[PDB]
């Protein structure tokens, strides 16, 4: 049964680092990729990065200095790490499964607010 679910800290202050987890079930992480996508309040979907079934990553060229994605193949989890947060990083964050070049299953997302 395919499920992907994100967990986040809900609210963080600017400059802090952030970690959001994606626990998946119903499939293995070696036959798929998981993409991280975010959506600022009142805006479209913005791509962040992906982790391939083989472990390699690819990031959004503009965030790449502050972004890091890894995964624990055994715990069935994928992690997104961000550093030096901006107040404009406020968004709802999703993880989604990439199968044969399409994002077929998405999580429900988690809302991150960068406060002060």
């Amino acid at each position: 049964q395919v499920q992907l679910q994100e967990s986040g800290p809900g609210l963080v202050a600017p400059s802090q680092s952030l970690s959001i987890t994606c626990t998946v079930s119903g499939f293995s992480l070696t036959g798929y990729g998981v993409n991280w996508v975010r959506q600022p309040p009142g805006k479209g979907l913005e791509w962040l990065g992906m982790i391939w079934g083989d472990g390699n990553t690819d990031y959004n060229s503009a965030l790449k200095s502050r972004l890091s994605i890894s995964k624990d193949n055994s715990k069935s989890q994928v992690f997104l790490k961000m550093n030096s947060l901006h107040t404009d990083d406020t968004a709802r964050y999703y993880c989604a499964r990439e199968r044969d070049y399409r994002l077929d299953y998405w999580g429900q997302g988690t809302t991150l607010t960068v406060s002060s």
Partner: protein
């Protein structure tokens, strides 16, 4: 990186109508285009992939078309549950990018 340009930003329509939304790449993404539907505060849902193929379970009233740098989604006979925001995203090279979206609203 390749960029997606979606026309139109907004589209007011009434049920029964057939609308067409378009996405133009900044380079040939060779049919590696997907379309998504996102209804009010929900996760985007896959409709069409590989330019024309329908996601299992999507009503055939949706049909995807295109090639090169020019792609489009046609909804023949809008049902009231079709209204929402639509997004195209390519899978030709990383960074994968999304179109700006089209907000389909009831006229």
């Amino acid at each position: 990186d390749i960029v997606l340009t979606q026309s139109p930003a907004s589209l007011s329509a009434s049920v029964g109508e057939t609308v067409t939304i378009t996405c133009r790449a900044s380079g040939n993404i060779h049919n590696y285009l997907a379309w998504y539907q996102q209804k009010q505060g929900k996760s985007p849902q896959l409709l069409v992939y590989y330019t024309t193929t329908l996601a299992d379970g999507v009503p055939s009233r949706f049909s995807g078309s295109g090639s090169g740098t020019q792609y489009s989604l046609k909804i023949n006979s809008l049902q009231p549950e079709d209204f929402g925001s639509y997004y195209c995203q390519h899978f030709w090279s990383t960074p994968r990018t999304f179109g700006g979206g089209t907000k389909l609203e009831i006229k």
